[PDB]
Amino acid sequence: NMLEALQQRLEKYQSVEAAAKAENNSGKARRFGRIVKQYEDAIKLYKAGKPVPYDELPVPPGFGGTTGEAIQKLRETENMLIKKQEFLEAKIEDELNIARKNASKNKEVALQALKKKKELEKQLQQIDGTLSTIEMQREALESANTNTAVLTTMKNAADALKRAHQNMDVDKVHDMMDD
C-alpha cells in the first residue's frame, strides 16, 4: 500500500534531520526540516482522502580509487546546491520584506514580490529533495568505504593473532613421541 511506504519515508527523513541536530548542521537541519513538513502535509492530505503531491516528495536512496573521486565529486556538488539554498533563502526573505513594505502603498509591487517569493520557494523545494538525496548517497558511500577498510585490517589482525598462536607445547609432545 501507499500509506505505510509514505510513513516509512517520513520516518527516514525524520531520522536524518534528527541526526543533523546532534552534529549541529543548521543548513542541513533547515532543509531536512522542510522535507518533513512536506510529508506531514502529505500525511494530513492522505488521511483526509485528498490528493497527495507524490511528484514533489523525494525518496531516500534504497526506498523503492574511483570510489574516493566519486565521493569528492558528490561533496563538490553538495557545496553548489548548499550555496544555491542560501541564495534562495535570502531572496525569499527579501521578497517578503518587499511585499510587506508595499502592501498598502504600492499594490502591484507587493503583489509581484509575492509571486517571485512563491516561485523561489518552489525552487528551494526542488533543491531540498535533490540535495538531501545526494547527502545521504554520499554518506552511504563513505560508510561503505570505511567498513571495507575496517573489515580488511581487522582480518589482518585476526590472522596476526592466529599466527602468534603456536601450540609449542603440543609440538613438544609430538617431538617426544617421534624420538
Tab-separated table of C-alpha atoms in Angstrom:
chain	number	residue	atom	x	y	z
A	1	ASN	CA	0.000	0.000	0.000
A	2	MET	CA	0.940	3.685	-0.134
A	3	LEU	CA	0.236	4.773	3.454
A	4	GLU	CA	2.964	2.618	5.020
A	5	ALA	CA	5.621	3.495	2.435
A	6	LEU	CA	4.657	7.147	2.901
A	7	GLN	CA	5.075	6.616	6.647
A	8	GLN	CA	8.356	4.736	6.173
A	9	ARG	CA	9.795	7.551	4.055
A	10	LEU	CA	8.707	10.192	6.578
A	11	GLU	CA	10.408	8.376	9.468
A	12	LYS	CA	13.616	8.208	7.424
A	13	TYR	CA	13.637	11.968	6.819
A	14	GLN	CA	12.773	12.412	10.496
A	15	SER	CA	15.767	10.222	11.340
A	16	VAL	CA	18.181	12.237	9.191
A	17	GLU	CA	17.026	15.640	10.452
A	18	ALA	CA	17.388	14.280	13.992
A	19	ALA	CA	20.969	13.253	13.221
A	20	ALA	CA	21.509	16.745	11.797
A	21	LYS	CA	20.592	18.207	15.202
A	22	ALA	CA	23.341	16.404	17.122
A	23	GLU	CA	26.039	17.288	14.581
A	24	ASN	CA	24.767	20.908	14.686
A	25	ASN	CA	24.367	21.358	10.921
A	26	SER	CA	21.889	24.233	10.714
A	27	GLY	CA	21.528	24.464	6.934
A	28	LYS	CA	21.023	20.704	6.753
A	29	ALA	CA	18.536	20.853	9.631
A	30	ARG	CA	16.549	23.578	7.862
A	31	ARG	CA	16.227	21.757	4.534
A	32	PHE	CA	15.510	18.394	6.161
A	33	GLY	CA	13.019	20.208	8.377
A	34	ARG	CA	11.258	21.497	5.269
A	35	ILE	CA	11.146	17.978	3.815
A	36	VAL	CA	9.386	16.528	6.858
A	37	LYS	CA	6.945	19.435	6.525
A	38	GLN	CA	6.171	18.176	3.015
A	39	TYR	CA	5.479	14.712	4.422
A	40	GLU	CA	3.499	15.993	7.418
A	41	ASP	CA	1.313	17.845	4.912
A	42	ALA	CA	1.130	14.758	2.690
A	43	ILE	CA	0.099	12.788	5.786
A	44	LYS	CA	-2.728	15.219	6.556
A	45	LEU	CA	-3.896	15.053	2.932
A	46	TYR	CA	-3.806	11.253	2.681
A	47	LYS	CA	-5.775	10.757	5.902
A	48	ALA	CA	-8.378	13.223	4.588
A	49	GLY	CA	-8.763	11.388	1.271
A	50	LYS	CA	-7.435	14.406	-0.636
A	51	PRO	CA	-4.879	14.245	-3.472
A	52	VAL	CA	-1.296	13.814	-2.279
A	53	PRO	CA	1.580	15.558	-4.165
A	54	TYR	CA	3.660	12.444	-4.789
A	55	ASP	CA	5.741	14.078	-7.537
A	56	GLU	CA	7.001	16.673	-5.024
A	57	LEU	CA	8.186	14.167	-2.406
A	58	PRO	CA	11.812	12.979	-2.511
A	59	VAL	CA	12.609	9.311	-1.936
A	60	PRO	CA	15.643	8.316	0.150
A	61	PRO	CA	18.136	6.083	-1.677
A	62	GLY	CA	17.049	2.458	-1.434
A	63	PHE	CA	13.363	3.076	-0.616
A	64	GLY	CA	11.962	1.627	-3.852
A	65	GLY	CA	40.340	4.677	-6.395
A	66	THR	CA	37.220	5.772	-8.254
A	67	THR	CA	35.184	5.496	-5.041
A	68	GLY	CA	37.172	8.304	-3.425
A	69	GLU	CA	36.869	10.509	-6.502
A	70	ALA	CA	33.132	9.793	-6.621
A	71	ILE	CA	32.809	10.975	-3.013
A	72	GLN	CA	34.778	14.121	-3.863
A	73	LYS	CA	32.550	14.846	-6.866
A	74	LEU	CA	29.462	14.430	-4.679
A	75	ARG	CA	30.870	16.726	-1.980
A	76	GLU	CA	31.613	19.442	-4.546
A	77	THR	CA	28.103	19.054	-5.967
A	78	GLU	CA	26.679	19.357	-2.447
A	79	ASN	CA	28.507	22.661	-1.947
A	80	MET	CA	26.970	24.169	-5.090
A	81	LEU	CA	23.479	23.109	-4.005
A	82	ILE	CA	24.111	24.460	-0.494
A	83	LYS	CA	25.206	27.826	-1.903
A	84	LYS	CA	22.031	27.897	-4.001
A	85	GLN	CA	19.907	27.095	-0.946
A	86	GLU	CA	21.372	30.055	0.955
A	87	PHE	CA	20.836	32.330	-2.054
A	88	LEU	CA	17.179	31.299	-2.297
A	89	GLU	CA	16.627	31.606	1.461
A	90	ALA	CA	17.949	35.181	1.435
A	91	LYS	CA	15.991	36.148	-1.690
A	92	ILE	CA	12.758	34.720	-0.259
A	93	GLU	CA	13.117	36.912	2.833
A	94	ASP	CA	13.930	39.928	0.650
A	95	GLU	CA	10.690	39.476	-1.299
A	96	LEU	CA	8.721	39.030	1.934
A	97	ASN	CA	10.054	42.372	3.177
A	98	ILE	CA	9.307	44.000	-0.187
A	99	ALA	CA	5.760	42.619	-0.065
A	100	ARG	CA	5.122	43.907	3.466
A	101	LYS	CA	6.538	47.408	2.933
A	102	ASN	CA	4.383	47.955	-0.170
A	103	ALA	CA	1.232	46.120	0.972
A	104	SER	CA	-0.822	49.316	1.243
A	105	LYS	CA	1.394	51.722	-0.726
A	106	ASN	CA	2.414	50.009	-3.993
A	107	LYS	CA	-0.167	47.304	-4.695
A	108	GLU	CA	1.397	45.952	-7.892
A	109	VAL	CA	4.924	45.856	-6.439
A	110	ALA	CA	3.904	43.957	-3.298
A	111	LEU	CA	1.903	41.506	-5.414
A	112	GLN	CA	4.861	40.995	-7.760
A	113	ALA	CA	7.171	40.274	-4.816
A	114	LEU	CA	4.759	37.598	-3.577
A	115	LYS	CA	4.726	35.873	-6.973
A	116	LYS	CA	8.532	35.866	-7.001
A	117	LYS	CA	8.570	34.531	-3.435
A	118	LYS	CA	6.220	31.686	-4.388
A	119	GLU	CA	8.424	30.758	-7.352
A	120	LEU	CA	11.592	30.920	-5.240
A	121	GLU	CA	10.022	28.566	-2.684
A	122	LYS	CA	9.285	26.021	-5.420
A	123	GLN	CA	12.935	26.212	-6.481
A	124	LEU	CA	14.023	25.833	-2.854
A	125	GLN	CA	11.842	22.725	-2.537
A	126	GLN	CA	13.369	21.090	-5.619
A	127	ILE	CA	16.863	21.914	-4.341
A	128	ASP	CA	15.902	20.355	-0.996
A	129	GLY	CA	14.957	16.989	-2.483
A	130	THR	CA	17.983	16.680	-4.760
A	131	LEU	CA	20.474	17.924	-2.159
A	132	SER	CA	19.072	15.645	0.553
A	133	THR	CA	19.348	12.633	-1.762
A	134	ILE	CA	22.975	13.422	-2.624
A	135	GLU	CA	23.899	13.934	1.042
A	136	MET	CA	22.512	10.542	2.069
A	137	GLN	CA	24.066	8.906	-1.000
A	138	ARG	CA	27.452	10.472	-0.234
A	139	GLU	CA	27.208	9.324	3.391
A	140	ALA	CA	26.414	5.741	2.366
A	141	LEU	CA	29.439	5.706	0.047
A	142	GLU	CA	31.756	6.973	2.792
A	143	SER	CA	30.324	4.469	5.281
A	144	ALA	CA	30.695	1.579	2.826
A	145	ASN	CA	34.279	2.656	2.117
A	146	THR	CA	35.122	2.851	5.827
A	147	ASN	CA	33.534	-0.510	6.668
A	148	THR	CA	35.526	-2.186	3.886
A	149	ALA	CA	38.761	-0.629	5.159
A	150	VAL	CA	37.975	-1.621	8.755
A	151	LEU	CA	36.988	-5.188	7.835
A	152	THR	CA	40.290	-5.616	5.993
A	153	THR	CA	42.661	-4.618	8.803
A	154	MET	CA	40.568	-6.497	11.367
A	155	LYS	CA	41.094	-9.546	9.146
A	156	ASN	CA	44.854	-8.918	9.152
A	157	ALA	CA	44.697	-8.550	12.939
A	158	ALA	CA	42.794	-11.811	13.419
A	159	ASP	CA	45.334	-13.528	11.163
A	160	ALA	CA	48.169	-11.930	13.142
A	161	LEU	CA	46.671	-13.243	16.388
A	162	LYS	CA	46.315	-16.678	14.774
A	163	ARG	CA	49.939	-16.702	13.599
A	164	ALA	CA	51.007	-15.804	17.154
A	165	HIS	CA	49.017	-18.795	18.488
A	166	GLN	CA	51.635	-21.520	18.082
A	167	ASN	CA	50.887	-24.593	20.216
A	168	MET	CA	54.524	-25.121	21.151
A	169	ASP	CA	53.542	-27.480	23.978
A	170	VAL	CA	51.660	-29.694	21.510
A	171	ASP	CA	54.711	-29.649	19.237
A	172	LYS	CA	56.848	-30.632	22.236
A	173	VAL	CA	54.712	-33.698	22.984
A	174	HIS	CA	54.830	-34.687	19.307
A	175	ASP	CA	58.596	-34.126	19.416
A	176	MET	CA	58.989	-36.615	22.270
A	177	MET	CA	56.722	-39.165	20.549
A	178	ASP	CA	58.868	-39.202	17.387
A	179	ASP	CA	62.100	-39.598	19.394
